[PDB]
Subunit: 463 residues, 4 copies
């Protein structure tokens, strides 16, 4: 009574699962009929999507290429080798001095595997405070001492912060902190920091306290590949990353690590085996070979002249957006940007990030509420350029986005003035708001004028 | 100088990345021109592959449906809700008594998140010993006390084993062990156990020592959904699983957990919030929404009449294979099977699992070497039925596979007799071996006669 | 308005503190007007007591002799050196192969310092189960997994047990257990085991699993010094001890450790520095120099011909007592003794250890209730020979003690027969019991016939 | 062949052990023929010494009074109860609000037992940095991250420091540190801090971060009993102490803890049972009953009018010494004292603490080298008043001690000027130094003029 392979196995999704097919179509329209400003998002290529959705998902290949536990790995080995060699090329790394492991399921597993490789349970870690622009996997506990991040459950973490008035990393306090706490590992990189990192200074702090130094470059890895921001590879021991943000690839993770002789015992680096062993067999099972193939595709694309121009454009778009906002009287943390995002301090407007985020989301403008230096109800919004830049928007287009944001914050203030400063009141002013429906229509019309990678808009089920 | 969206973003893989496209094509041919007997593998549907390779990879949706940190989740919420409700339906679970989290990136992250949710660092865990058929994520350290599994790095594990002479789980020693070691969590389920599990007895042991009881049903989850083996849901607190083995879905993980009133304070279960919080924000970042959509598809497919028939066929095929092997004088661990695999003890033949695995791999027969009870160089091979059954093979076809295995072990013995019992010698007998080249040709001819899900063979680049 | 030094500082205790002086006098009478059978007790010499109560208590001398943090240590150094060299002599240890640290405040700190020296937090330890005759500092958690012993809080312990029917250590289960659990440290020695230890076998088990081996010889250290039981020094890495039980010294602890070349890298032992550093500065402050002086005295006394004869007598007295008990139909665990104690199984009499202990304590016979193999309300009493042997009792005197115990258990049964088997009932039968008052008078009369070390009975305040 | 009880057991030390007896006599002379300025030392009463050296050492009494595991404790219970009730009286504590455990073997075991009672392994602790005047048991690791203190091995510690320029505790940095690190326990009290503690402010910091607050009052407990410094009992949850420094008792420890209703659930304090259980059975075995009797004596003595006058004198003597030093141009940390010690900063003289300590020790002046705020070879000496004040020295006598110190530092400078600033050179100037031999003779003559508690100088073997 078994179904024929043609019926269950070869039939397209639109017949097998209409419900899911319909929902994907609506998500496809949503992605191209709004303004996507989530700084951790991007629209990847169709080529990447074709590798991701391939028979590569069927192959179970525990181990490394050339040291696998089962047979039949002739072509999976070649894909993984190509993915690794392309990873080194994309970041201009000499293979004698750097290795990479491309099996992490995602960025957060890449981080935790890196920790497991070089630390023992309860070893001390320092990372950029969440409220200062850091990331959950770098450590996070609450004021009640509740350990939220797994990094803070299995290791002992302590955050360093930005200067309270300037919004830049306080390198003097970082150093004083590291000399007190004596971390075995210092993490640099972050999720909502709008400036570049002084990796040289991090290296100096690390050397002074006897720490390893790791960069989580998840957010800016695309800018790093195109050499548009400082490279962490010059000064860090280990570099982890996600592959889907500014790098514009699939959802995956990578761990880069130093190889060969150490700088001034005639000693050599010892990370390669520990890192690989941490990924498998300690933490992961078989790799997601479709992710590795998709990632190999993304890495080749990342090494093209067009990608360096894209990374330049991402930077120029964020700058032109920020300058447009500041021209309207708005205040940005650090007063500008050097990367892909702006951090908009709304406290001078009497507004909360949540209120602006909610109203923007009603106009199909997706940003995210975000903490700002000394927040104690986050008081800012975080806006990123990668996704809309991938759709071909240039500086003039990002100035229009700034106008849309300007219109949106204006509607937020008019609501707050009319209905009240309490969240209960603010909501009353959204109901049947003509002005909100008008901005929504303009956003959708503006959004619809640009192209869209990954799927053909002239094949969409909803237009 | 940016590339047009059409050039980099809409162009097919075969133009963007010829190398990777070619390698995927060869892997596609390899998958249908050999005999795939790795018990942890399957060939998933094309519908699953279409959801997996979709614009769903572009959406970042940290949190749970209805409690997300960013906007634009209208359709992702609906996909995740449908995936969860289908997960409960597929395993015949009342929603008032069971919840499920579908965000784990894979099976090994699902396990570790479950541990994190209910245990503190260094809590004691018991699982099926690796050499007795268990899995790395259930705990593993070596005789030198080297902690291999992350489960054994961050927690205190102790394995229980099968009876040395029968190959069945020794439930008496399990109970004596648990009463001595007092684990906070007992794990059941395994990777290479050929019999069903007595979950009732596990529950009795767990109750006697005050332990939680978790089933990792990764290998048999398809059989569990079709109610062809014992359900762990009747007796376990938590059930984790991978979704790509006998379940025939994408690579993903799920964590099921009890809800509602406890059995005999009028107390209720407390797993839902801990489990969800452990997945996010403690360990993972944003979910892989394309995996969740693909998984939702697989779960609907798993709930069809054809899937119950497929699970019945998997069981019948493994049994008919085992009986064919034993009819040739071969010995199976426990003398048969009740699930999807057979475990073939090669020590009575004077052979090592590696030697049979190597020669089978030369004939495009992929099995894996596997330990057998008291091994001290694994002495068996593990053979599974799910993948070839997905291609439509029935019992007569699995008897022919048994003949191919019989021919292969015969060629292995002829080599060992001629060239020697040392691994160095065995290899000498592979070079330009006509007889090996003949079995390979028969395997490829037999393999080519069957259909193949996930991609159309009449569109293959290599035929 | 300060008191003159003569008034507060030179005045005797009997004037400064009549209350405390009176209470010490009553304790002195109690010690010599009853029968002391607590196996962990002894009556030390007056010489030991004079060193203990000396100006040595005034000196603070952090560090080791020859490496102190402060001046004025000329004579404290010499006392500590003499105490250490006498410690090696007392146990017939070559100084090139063994070192000793004499600063532990007591036996339990000596154990914990030894653990700290050679283990990391959460390392695995195995020791003799409490219910099988072991000691709390070797590890103890309850059936609910509550960690009682600090050894079980800061380290991971697992107990091994005696055979359930014979009462001897089950060396086969010990080995099977150690190969499963892989402890970093195995502890031998115990508090209520009546037989000698097979240290050679412990060494074999330890070598097979890669464990350190430590003996806690607190109870039998006097017998060890006199070479009347097996020496742990032949086979263990570390030997800890208390100094006041069968060794007949002050309350103090010592840690012995191997030095010099290892047995078959041309490697040497590495315990000396770790051990010393663990005692100070990790765990302890300045040593109790009066204890070290008293201990030096006890060690010289322990090296006299009279002490070897005393240790022989202790053994002969316990044997003659046990034989007297068994002649009356009583049952001893293992059916006898090879050391200083007997373990009396009262379950064949229908009696609990508590009931016999309580009634004996009413007749000034101090024993202690004690678990027996498989107890699930301890079912035995533990009786030791050191204290009464120190008062000069020989075999005939210990046969009379056996008669007193025999009379006491007879009164316990007569009470249980008349009033009932519930603890509530048993108590009713103690009130104004003539027969109990008669045994008490005979015990006190018999007790008063012997001499008493440490203080002059003909100077007692209460006679 | 056993020795008679009279021979080994009643014979005095001077016959049993001439070596040890002779060495104690020389230590007795050393104690009264020099100037003892070690701040952690005292000369206790003869009454204390008589209880310490008594048959109380023979009794093994595991448990608490009224809940013991063995019989024969009638009089030991009464001694322990009296010792506890006297402990509460001595510190003016209401029994309904405070309990005390008097079994800790010493101060360092009292601290670790307190930690064990209220913390889990790896909980965070903050204490006064060693270099700022704190104590090893409050936490200590080196710049290489080597964990020295057991407090830093089993728990996670972070030190707070004194202000770099004033030498007072930096309460602002303490609070900022505690809000970052979130310790579960903050420790106050120290070994070389010359000022009082603002426990109210510590309580404020503790409340703000959700921490327990513990005072280790080992050094100043005598001053605390006499109400001559701030009481930690007003604001701390737990108070530990040693009993032999300014308290002038035996070597022992105590743990005080709050009882009864908490200040603003109608909740009550929960320390009593945890504290008692941590002492026994978790960490310690049977208590040292002779210490408890001696301590009971010391506590009664501590509650006399003469003791309050003695504590006043200690404070006045340290002040008069400090003023004398500063009158000679010397510099003290914080410019004076409020307690029993002065901390003398020698860096303005171009001298190291070791050099002054070494030369003082050659003149029978025992001080100890000590770190000073920001030291990076300690640069100070720590001098304490309790011991010499116990011999009856008043302010005029401490001015003469200041002159002796002045003469000694003068001889140190003359040596450094003649022979050199390298330690190698300084030593050359000690050989056959007439001037050093002259100060030694004056110190011994001055020292001999005063009385001496604990033993009669007119019975000394060496005069």
């Amino acid at each position: 009574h078994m179904d024929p392979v043609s019926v269950w196995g070869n039939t397209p999704l639109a017949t097998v699962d209409p419900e899911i097919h319909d929902l994907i179509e609506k998500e496809k329209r949503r992605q191209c009929r709004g303004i996507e400003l989530i700084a951790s998002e991007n629209f990847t290529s169709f080529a990447v999507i074709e590798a991701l959705g391939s028979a590569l998902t069927n192959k179970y290949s525990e181990g490394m290429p050339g040291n696998r536990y089962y047979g039949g790995n002739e072509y999976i080995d070649q894909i993984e080798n190509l993915c690794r060699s392309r990873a080194l090329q994309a970041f201009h790394l000499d293979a004698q001095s750097w290795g990479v492991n491309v099996q992490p399921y995602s960025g957060s597993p890449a981080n935790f595997a890196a920790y497991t490789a070089v630390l023992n349970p309860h070893d001390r870690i320092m990372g950029l405070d969440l409220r200062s622009g850091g990331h959950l996997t770098h450590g996070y506990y609450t004021s009640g001492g509740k350990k939220i991040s797994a990094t803070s459950i299995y290791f002992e973490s302590l955050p360093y912060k930005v200067n309270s008035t300037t919004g830049y990393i306080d390198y003097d306090r970082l150093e004083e902190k590291a000399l007190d706490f004596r971390p075995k590992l210092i993490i640099c990189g972050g999720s909502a920091y709008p400036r570049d990192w002084d990796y040289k200074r991090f290296r100096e702090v690390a050397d002074k306290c006897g720490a390893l130094l790791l960069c989580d470059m998840a957010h800016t890895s695309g800018l790093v590949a195109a050499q548009e921001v400082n490279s962490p590879f010059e000064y860090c021991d280990i570099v982890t990353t996600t592959t889907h943000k500014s790098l514009r690839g699939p959802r995956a993770g990578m761990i880069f690590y130093r190889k060969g002789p150490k700088p001034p015992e005639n000693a050599v680096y010892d990370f390669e085996d520990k890192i690989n062993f941490a990924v498998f067999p300690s933490l992961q099972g078989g790799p997601h070979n479709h992710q590795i193939g998709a990632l190999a595709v993304a890495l080749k694309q990342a090494a093209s002249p067009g990608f360096k121009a894209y990374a330049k454009q991402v930077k120029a778009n964020a700058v032109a957006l920020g300058k447009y906002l500041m021209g309207k009287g708005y205040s940005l943390v650090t007063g500008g940007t050097e990367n892909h995002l702006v951090l908009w301090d709304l406290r001078p407007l009497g507004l909360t990030g949540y209120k602006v985020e909610k109203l923007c989301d009603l106009c199909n403008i997706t940003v995210n509420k975000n903490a700002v230096f000394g927040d104690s109800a986050p008081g800012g919004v975080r806006i990123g350029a990668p996704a809309m830049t991938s759709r071909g928007l240039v500086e003039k287009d990002f100035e229009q986005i700034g106008e849309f944001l300007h219109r949106a914050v204006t509607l937020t203030l008019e609501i707050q003035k009319e209905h009240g400063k309490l969240l209960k009141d603010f909501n009353k002013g959204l109901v049947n708001n003509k002005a909100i429906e008008d901005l929504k229509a303009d956003v959708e019309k503006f959004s619809a004028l640009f192209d869209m990678p990954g799927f053909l808009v002239s094949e969409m089920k909803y237009k």
